[PDB]
Structure formats: structure tokens, C-alpha cells
């Protein structure tokens, strides 16, 4: 029940988040033509929103790979990462 | 918060949840939040795609290769409540079996050590674990444990095959009740041999270190509290699991894995960084390096 | 050729990035060193830059931005916000000894001294520094190759692209008689180059075709000053000398060189001509804006 | 069959070059002739050109791109453009590929600068111009040039 309440809170936050995104589109909308000098916009938030949707309260929260994977090696190691590459070519 | 973390991490390129190397180090199965189970091949260090096994209604979580003694088998679980087993027959990467016996998401899978047969253990987010045992043909009989963990299960890890030289297998798993339950199986049914409460929040991952022939069996665990514990058993047959703190980060630890020979812990979590740890000659754990 | 007394000995002149109509100018040698933007065409002193520090480097850093290098080898750049008539001083570095010329390789404003301090596009940290002492030729033969020409007129192709601090090649006359004042590098092909001899000669160069002294001359009187060249007619160009003189060597014509400019004055400031000045070795005050 | 084998050789040859105009003159001239036979056979027959354009084993579009990206000779870059002609005659697929190439244009600008610096008497320039003209003949695609602001088709 507590988890459901938190999702209800989480859901409310998402609605608030959706409203914020809408405001950004509304405030940040840019319409220059035919060709106009590029201007700053919250292009990134939309990209992150899709990722958040894919991840999707409690479930989504404790369902997002903190990285999130560990590789175990025999003789001897392997690589791993998550992540700046997720394999290293070690010389 | 989480939103702030997301803002900090834009993501240079698409992301994947788990990805495990094959036995013999030939293939490299992966899965991501797009519902796609990609099998790559790594001959000479170069990654080459072989197949995109699509078939899950939700994001795939963890993935595990079966032992090559049973041919070439790979199993993946998902947020769709289903688990898929893909066989291979001449490049014929078809699914020979599918299991949908849990009502909520399936956080993790793992294969029993190859001697016990072809047993696959699976922990759901309903709080139940379903284990699939292979018979002669395409039948798979399920041994289900209902209400294993209170609000759901995240990790499942098999105890190393230990010859009684009449065979006893022990499995310990973590979940979102904070408890790292170990499991004992007799004729068929599995009972909780013990509970392990040292985490102050949701157990993320739980890895049973391979025994180097050594009888001092260890298990590692990581949780939302940001602590890593290396629980130890001092001797065979004494129900004493004494936890010892490896480290605490201010952020969550997602995954933990044991390196085969030296028992090096790969701690994945916190700040998008992964650390490597070796127990010193003094019994304190230390960070070898930053990856 | 409408002249105009600035009553200010000019050191710089740019047909600005925006024909040769937006004039800007930098006036060195005054008690608070000077530069004006939008002047004049008609008074139009919109940005008569009140400025400490003089003008060693100078570049229209946009059509609304202006780069420059300051007297002690300092650096100075603002953004020419011609709408609201104010600006913001972009670049201000301390100790980049002055600089001897100005090169470009977009948008790393490369240059040479008379040591190299490679600042670049938003590179407010001095990134590359092949600190090789120079015993004034500076350009981009190809990105990001260059050729330092010391005051023996001693050209040497080095870089900042790969690592290293030597030069890769060297161009040299038989006798090294003149000093580093004025070399040429053709827009017809960025492997084509010349120079002007400070006796009044040319010094034409071949990169691929050996390295010989192709074409000297004997035409002008004083040190090599600077050359007006058409910004689209590569061949069209005319010559000059270091009193501020100017002999029209009609090089899109064939030696057709005459007493060209409104002559006989003191020296001329710095060169940019498209559609104008060809600044002398001594940079005095002069003007004409009829360059077609 | 034989064409597929030739495509495999091109992929293999390209890989060898990458590992290493970076190859025996007689062997390179051989490759120029392979690509010149390829270009001619594709244009002349509609069916053959279609087969070249969309046959998975051959991988002509990708191999050509790799060759272009890698340091390469002028005759070789000309035969890549003659190959592209078949696909052009076969537009969205081509436009998308062009967009991908642009994404992989600073590099294009660098190439233009190199051309300005050179080059072998302008023998390379004409074929590229012709390919551009054929593409232009093909109907324009709204989707292409979307990633850059406002007018992606115009800049070329």
C-alpha cells in the first residue's frame, strides 16, 4: 500500500514533470525559417523522457540498472564496464 | 535525486542492462530496455552481431548462458513476466521453451552448476522464484516457491557444486525486503535454510563466489543503502553467516560479480563507475583500481 | 578615392565580415590606443573602442565579433554587437614580447612572434604551446601546418597538428638579406606562395616544384609593405613600398606596374580588400574607399 | 556469384588496406578494372544494376563508403561514384546513406580543402559532379537534412 502511495506520489511527480516538459516546449519552442541561427533548447529532456518511459513507481525506481552489470573472470579477467567505451582492449 | 542523476547522465550511446560472455569466451549475449536479446561474437576482440532474438513485451533484465554440455542454450528474463530459453541447432537460434508462471516481472535468472543437471532458477518481482528442470525431450517441470521475499526478488545466485565426497545444493537470493535468504533443497522442494538481514534497504544483487576448491564459501551482496557485504561461512555444516562490510558509497550499488581465481569483486554502482576489490592479507577489503 | 583624415595614425583596416563597405580600423600609437568599428563610411563611430593595449593581432571574430591581440603579446577580443552598440570583451590573455603577424586556421587563431601560444575557438586555456624561440611569417598552408619565418626571412614549415617542436621543412633564400616583413601564400592553391623583397623585389615560391626562389623583382623602393589582392580575383593584385607607396602591378593582366595610389603620403595601415588598404611597414594614417 | 565474390574481395581488400595507394600498382590497377567493369555492367542493364543495388552478400554500398573513408586513390573514388550510379537509377535509401555519411560535414569540408590543395589535374572532380546531378534528378526527400536545422537539402 505504501509503495502504491509512493507511485501515486511518483505519478504526481511525473505529471508535474510532464507539465514542466510542456512548459519547456512552450517556452523553448523555436521556429526560425527558412534557415536561422541555432538557438539553445531543452532537446536533451525529450531524449531522457523516452528512456524513463522504457525504464517504467517502486518497480521503476528499483528497476533501473545503477550502471549496472558486473563481469566475472577466470583465467583471468574479462573486461566489463557499462561503460566509458563496455570492453577494454588492454595492451 | 534520480531526475538529477538522469540530467547528469545524458547517455553517449544506447544502453544495455546485463550482458554475459559465453563459456569458452566465444559469444557475448546482451539485452537492453528495447526488448531485444542480441547475441554478439567476439573473435579477436572485435564485436560482430549474429542474431536479434526479439520476443519480450517488456525490457529484458538479466541473461545467462547454459553450460556447453547441453549444446548451446541461452536464457533471458524480462519485465513481461516471461522467461525465454533459446536453443541453437546449426545456426537455428529458435526458442525451444518459454515459461510464464510468475505474475509480476522477472528480475533475474541463473543456471545451476552443470553437475546438478540443467536447472534454471528464476526470481520474480511478485516475491516468487520459479525453477525449471530439464527432462528427456521438450518438457520442463517447474518447482515454484511462493512468497520467498516480501515485496519481490532481485537476485538469484547458485551455490558452487560441492561434492559430498547424497548431494546437497544451497542457493541464496536477495530481494526487496532487505533479506538475503539462502535456500536448501531435499527430495524436490526448496526450503529457506536461513535469512540474512544486514541491509537497510532493497538487496540489489547477490553473488555466490566460486569456491577455489577452498571450503570457506563466501557470498557478496549490494543494496540501495550503498553498502557491499561479503558474508562468510567459517566452516562446512555450521549455520553461521558472519557479514563483513566491504565499503559504503553515498549512492546505490547495482551489480556485484566475482572474478574466478583471485576472488576479486567487481562492484558496479554509485557514480557510473565500477571498482575492483581484493581481500588483503590482513582481511580488510581494498579497491585495486577504478575501471 | 574619397580620402578621410582620421587625425589618427592608422595601424589596422578590415573590410569586415558581414563589399568593402563596413570598414573597421585599429589605431595604434596613441595615448589610449585606439580602434573604431562601423567607422566611417557616415561619421558612424559606433564602436570607437576605448582601449588600453594596442593592436598586434586583429580579426573580425564574427560579423558580430572581433578578435585581436594586445601590445605586450596580450590578447583582446570582444563581440561586436552592432545592434545595441555595446559589446562584451571575450578574450583577455596576459602573456601569449609582442606578436609579429597574424595567421588563421579556423577557428584556432594561430600566429607567430618576433614562441607560439595556440589559443583557439573558446579555448580560453592555452592548449598547444610549441615554445620554440623565433630568431613573422605565419599562415595555414594546410590545417594545421604552418611555417615560421624568422627575421632572417627564414621560413620553416612546422605544425601544431602532430606532436613535436621542430619544423618539418624550411624555405630560405640564398642570402638571407632582408628581415621578416611580408610573405605571400596564394588563395589560388594553399600550396602556392610568394613573398615580397624588402628591396622592392618579389620572392615567389614553389612548394611542390622544388623549393627554389622562383621570382624576385626590383620594382619597389622600400621594405615590403603589403599587397592589395582581389578577394576573388586571385591574380589581380598590386604592389607597394614602405613609405606607404603603391605601384600597381597589374597581375591579372604583362608587367604593368605604375604609380598607383593617391601617393606620396606617409605609411598605410593593414590589408583587407574585397569588392580597403595594403598596409605599409610603418602604418600611418591614410584612406580611400572606392575599391571597385 | 562472381559479382558477389568480387564484392567479398573488395570487403577483404578494404580490410587488408586498413590493416596495412597502400597496395602493389598491378593489384590496385586490377581493382580499378574490377570497379570499372562493375560500373559499366550496372548502368547498361536495369536488372543487373538492381541486383547490385540491393544484394546482401555483395555489400557494395557499405564497402564503397569504407573505401571512401579510408585513405584512397582518385581512380578508386571515381569507381565508387560509378557504383553509386546504379543505386541512384534503381532515392530515400540513397539520401539516408548520404545523411549517414555526413554524420560520419566537417570531414566533407576537409575533403574539399584537400581538393583545393590538389589535385591530380581535376580528373577526380567530374564524376562526383555527375553523381550529384543524378541524385538531384531523383526526387528530394523531406526527411533528409532534418537533423541539421531548417534546410538540409540546400547546403549541398
TrEMBL record, chain B:
WD repeats lie at residues 53-96, 196-231. Gene3D superfamilies: YVTN repeat-like/Quinoprotein amine dehydrogenase. GO terms for biological process: COPII-coated vesicle budding; mRNA transport; positive regulation of TOR signaling; protein exit from endoplasmic reticulum; protein import into nucleus. GO terms for molecular function: structural molecule activity. GO terms for cellular component: COPII vesicle coat; cytosol; lysosomal membrane; nuclear pore outer ring. Functions as a component of the nuclear pore complex (NPC) and the COPII coat. At the endoplasmic reticulum, SEC13 is involved in the biogenesis of COPII-coated vesicles. Required for the exit of adipsin (CFD/ADN), an adipocyte-secreted protein from the endoplasmic reticulum. As a component of the GATOR2 complex, functions as an activator of the amino acid-sensing branch of the mTORC1 signaling pathway. The GATOR2 complex indirectly activates mTORC1 through the inhibition of the GATOR1 subcomplex. GATOR2 probably acts as an E3 ubiquitin-protein ligase toward GATOR1. In the presence of abundant amino acids, the GATOR2 complex mediates ubiquitination of the NPRL2 core component of the GATOR1 complex, leading to GATOR1 inactivation. In the absence of amino acids, GATOR2 is inhibited, activating the GATOR1 complex. The gene is sec13.S. The lineage of its organism: Eukaryota, Metazoa, Chordata, Craniata, Vertebrata. This is Protein SEC13 homolog. It comes from Xenopus laevis (African clawed frog). The keyword tRNA processing does not apply.
TrEMBL record, chain C:
Keywords: Nucleus, Repeat, WD repeat. GO terms for cellular component: cytosol; nuclear pore outer ring. Pfam families: WD40. Gene3D superfamilies: YVTN repeat-like/Quinoprotein amine dehydrogenase. PANTHER family: NUCLEOPORIN NUP43 (PTHR22652). The keyword Lipoprotein does not apply. This is MGC154553 protein. InterPro entries: WD40/YVTN_repeat-like_dom_sf, WD40_repeat_CS, WD40_repeat_dom_sf, WD40_rpt. WD repeats lie at residues 173-215, 217-253. The keyword Repeat applies. It is found in: Nucleus.
TrEMBL record, chain D:
It is found in: Nucleus. Belongs to the NUP186/NUP192/NUP205 family. This is MGC83295 protein. It comes from Xenopus laevis (African clawed frog). The chain holds residues 550 to 732 of 2011 of the full protein.
Amino acid at each position: 500500500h505504501l509503495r502504491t502511495v509512493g507511485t501515486r506520489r511518483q505519478q504526481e511527480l511525473v505529471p508535474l514533470e510532464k507539465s514542466v516538459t510542456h512548459g519547456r516546449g512552450s517556452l523553448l519552442i523555436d521556429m526560425g525559417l527558412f534557415m536561422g541561427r541555432s538557438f539553445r533548447v531543452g532537446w536533451g529532456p525529450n531524449w531522457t523522457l523516452v528512456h524513463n518511459g522504457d525504464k517504467l513507481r517502486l518497480n521503476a525506481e528499483e528497476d533501473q540498472n545503477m550502471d549496472t552489470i558486473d563481469y566475472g573472470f577466470l583465467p583471468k579477467p574479462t573486461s566489463a564496464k557499462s561503460t566509458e567505451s563496455k570492453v577494454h582492449m588492454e595492451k | 535525486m534520480v531526475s538529477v542523476i538522469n540530467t547528469v547522465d545524458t547517455s553517449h550511446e544506447d544502453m544495455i542492462h546485463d550482458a554475459q560472455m559465453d563459456y569458452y569466451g566465444i559469444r557475448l549475449a546482451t539485452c537492453s530496455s528495447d526488448r531485444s536479446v542480441k547475441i554478439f561474437d567476439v573473435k579477436n576482440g572485435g564485436q560482430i552481431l549474429i542474431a536479434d532474438l526479439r520476443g519480450h513485451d517488456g525490457p529484458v533484465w538479466q541473461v545467462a548462458w547454459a553450460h556447453p554440455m547441453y549444446g548451446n542454450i541461452l536464457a533471458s528474463c524480462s519485465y513481461d513476466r516471461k522467461v525465454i530459453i533459446w536453443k541453437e541447432e546449426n545456426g537455428t537460434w529458435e526458442k525451444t521453451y518459454e515459461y510464464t508462471g510468475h505474475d509480476s516481472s522477472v528480475n533475474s535468472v541463473c543456471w545451476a552448476p552443470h553437475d546438478f543437471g540443467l536447472v534454471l532458477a528464476c526470481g520474480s518481482s511478485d516475491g516468487a522464484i520459479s525453477i525449471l528442470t530439464f527432462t528427456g525431450d521438450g518438457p520442463w517441470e517447474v518447482k515454484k516457491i511462493s512468497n520467498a521475499h516480501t515485496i519481490g526478488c532481485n537476485a538469484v545466485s547458485w551455490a558452487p557444486s560441492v561434492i559430498p565426497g547424497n548431494y546437497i545444493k544451497r542457493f541464496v537470493s536477495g530481494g526487496c525486503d532487505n533479506l538475503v535468504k539462502i535456500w536448501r533443497e531435499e527430495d524436490g522442494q526448496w526450503k529457506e535454510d536461513q535469512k540474512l538481514e544486514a541491509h537497510s534497504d532493497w538487496v540489489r544483487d547477490v553473488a555466490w563466489a566460486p569456491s577455489i576448491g577452498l571450503p570457506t564459501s563466501t557470498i557478496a551482496s549490494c543494496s540501495q543503502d550503498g553498502r557491499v557485504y561479503i558474508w562468510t561461512s567459517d566452516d562446512a555444516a555450521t549455520n553461521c553467516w558472519t557479514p563483513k562490510l566491504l565499503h559504503k558509497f553515498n549512492d546505490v550499488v547495482w551489480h556485484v560479480s566475482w572474478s574466478i581465481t583471485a576472488n576479486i569483486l567487481a562492484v558496479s554502482g554509485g557514480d557510473n563507475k565500477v571498482t575492483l576489490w581484493k581481500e588483503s592479507v590482513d582481511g580488510q577489503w581494498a579497491c585495486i583500481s577504478d575501471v | 578615392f574619397a580620402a578621410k583624415f582620421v587625425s589618427h595614425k592608422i595601424s589596422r583596416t578590415r573590410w569586415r565580415p558581414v563589399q568593402p563597405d563596413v570598414f573597421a580600423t585599429g589605431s595604434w600609437d596613441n595615448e589610449e590606443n585606439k580602434v573604431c568599428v562601423w567607422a566611417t563610411s557616415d561619421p558612424k563611430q559606433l564602436c570607437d573602442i576605448k582601449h588600453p593595449g594596442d593592436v598586434m593581432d586583429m580579426q573580425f571574430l564574427d560579423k558580430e565579433r572581433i578578435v585581436t591581440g594586445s601590445s605586450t603579446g596580450t590578447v583582446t577580443i570582444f563581440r561586436h554587437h552592432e545592434n545595441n552598440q555595446t559589446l562584451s570583451v571575450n578574450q583577455r590573455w596576459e602573456q601569449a614580447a609582442p606578436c609579429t603577424a597574424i595567421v588563421c586556421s579556423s577557428p584556432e587563431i594561430v600566429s607567430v612572434g618576433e614562441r607560439i601560444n595556440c589559443f583557439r575557438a573558446e579555448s580560453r586555456d592555452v592548449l598547444r604551446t610549441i615554445d620554440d624561440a623565433d630568431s613573422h611569417g605565419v599562415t595555414f598552408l594546410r590545417t594545421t601546418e604552418i611555417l615560421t619565418v624568422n627575421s632572417v626571412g627564414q621560413l620553416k614549415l612546422w605544425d601544431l597538428r602532430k606532436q613535436g617542436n621542430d619544423p618539418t621543412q624550411i624555405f630560405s633564400v640564398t642570402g638571407e638579406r632582408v628581415p621578416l616583413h611580408c610573405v605571400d601564400r596564394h588563395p589560388n592553391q594553399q600550396h602556392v606562395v610568394a613573398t615580397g623583397g624588402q628591396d622592392g623585389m618579389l620572392c615567389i615560391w614553389d612548394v611542390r616544384h622544388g623549393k627554389m626562389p622562383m621570382s624576385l623583382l626590383n620594382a619597389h623602393e622600400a621594405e615590403m609593405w603589403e599587397v592589395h589582392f582581389h578577394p576573388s580575383n586571385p591574380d589581380h593584385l598590386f604592389t607597394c613600398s614602405e613609405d606607404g607607396s603603391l605601384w600597381h602591378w597589374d597581375a591579372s593582366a604583362q608587367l604593368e606596374i605604375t604609380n598607383l595610389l593617391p601617393s606620396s603620403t606617409l605609411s598605410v595601415n593593414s590589408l583587407d580588400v574585397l569588392g580597403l588598404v595594403c598596409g605599409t611597414d610603418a602604418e600611418a594614417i591614410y584612406v580611400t574607399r572606392r575599391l571597385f | 556469384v562472381s559479382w558477389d565474390h568480387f564484392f567479398h574481395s573488395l570487403m577483404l581488400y578494404h580490410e587488408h588496406l586498413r590493416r596495412d595507394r597502400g597496395i602493389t600498382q598491378r593489384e590496385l590497377d586490377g581493382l580499378i578494372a574490377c570497379l570499372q567493369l562493375t560500373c559499366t555492367i550496372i548502368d547498361w542493364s536495369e536488372s543487373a544494376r538492381l541486383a547490385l543495388c540491393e544484394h546482401a552478400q555483395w555489400m557494395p554500398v557499405v564497402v564503397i563508403l569504407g573505401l571512401l573513408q579510408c585513405s584512397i586513390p582518385p581512380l578508386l573514388k571515381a569507381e565508387l561514384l560509378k557504383t553509386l550510379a546504379a543505386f541512384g537509377k534503381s532515392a530515400a535509401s540513397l539520401w539516408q546513406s548520404l545523411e549517414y555519411t555526413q554524420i560520419l560535414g566537417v570531414g566533407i569540408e576537409v575533403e574539399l580543402n584537400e581538393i583545393e590543395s590538389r589535385c591530380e589535374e581535376y580528373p577526380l572532380t567530374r564524376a562526383f559532379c555527375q553523381l550529384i546531378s543524378t541524385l538531384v534528378e531523383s526526387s528530394f526527400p523531406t526527411n533528409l537534412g532534418a537533423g541539421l536545422r531548417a534546410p538540409g537539402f540546400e547546403p549541398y
